[PDB]
């Protein structure tokens, strides 16, 4: 039951999607507001550290989400040669090389690798209850080496 349905986007389409994250940045936190919020996350945008996620142009930021909101996540894999995933868990860091993160509350399978001048992306919806979550990549070693961030749902 992970989201394993992918579409393909050209680079100008990727840039257009990254700009549609509806959060507001303060330091290394992104704060969302409203009834429906749009999170747009990318795996290793050009020039950012490997391995990492970027959301609203920040590396692995803490996401602050209002209670009761509908969360629409768009995940784009921009990293040549790797098929990163985006998975939400309540299991905490530090993560092992093969992390134990079940149950996965929402998230993706492994993404397509970039090819033919295009990039794979997907959309999924999430209706969380209040608490702390983490977003992680499942490729062995990546979470252990820093590819994760925190989500606080009020
Ligand atoms: Cu990864």
From Swiss-Prot:
Named cofactor requirement(s): Cu cation
Molecular function terms, GO-annotated: copper ion binding; electron transfer activity
Domain Plastocyanin-like stretches: 52-154
Cofactor binding annotation: Binds 1 copper ion per subunit.
Entry keyword set: Copper, Electron transport, Metal-binding, Periplasm, Signal, Transport
Record localization: Periplasm
Binding, Cu cation: 84, 137, 142, 147
GO CC list: periplasmic space
Role of this protein: Electron carrier from cytochrome c552 to the A-type oxidase.
Subunit-level organization: Monomer.
UniProt protein name: Rusticyanin
């Amino acid at each position: 039951a992970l989201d394993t349905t992918w579409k393909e986007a050209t680079l100008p389409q990727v840039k257009a999607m990254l700009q549609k994250d509806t959060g507001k940045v303060s330091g290394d936190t992104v704060t969302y507001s409203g009834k429906t919020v749009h999170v747009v996350a990318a795996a290793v945008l050009p020039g950012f550290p490997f391995p990492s996620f970027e959301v609203h142009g920040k590396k692995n930021p803490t996401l602050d989400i209002p209670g009761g909101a509908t969360v629409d996540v768009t995940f784009i894999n921009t990293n040549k040669g790797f098929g990163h995933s985006f998975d939400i868990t309540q299991k905490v860091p530090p993560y092992a090389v093969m992390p134990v993160i079940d149950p996965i509350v929402a998230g993706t399978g492994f993404s397509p690798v970039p090819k033919d001048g295009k990039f794979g992306y997907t959309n999924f919806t999430w209706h969380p209850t209040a608490g702390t979550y983490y977003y992680v990549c499942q490729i062995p070693g990546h979470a252990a080496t820093g590819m994760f961030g925190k989500i606080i749902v009020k």
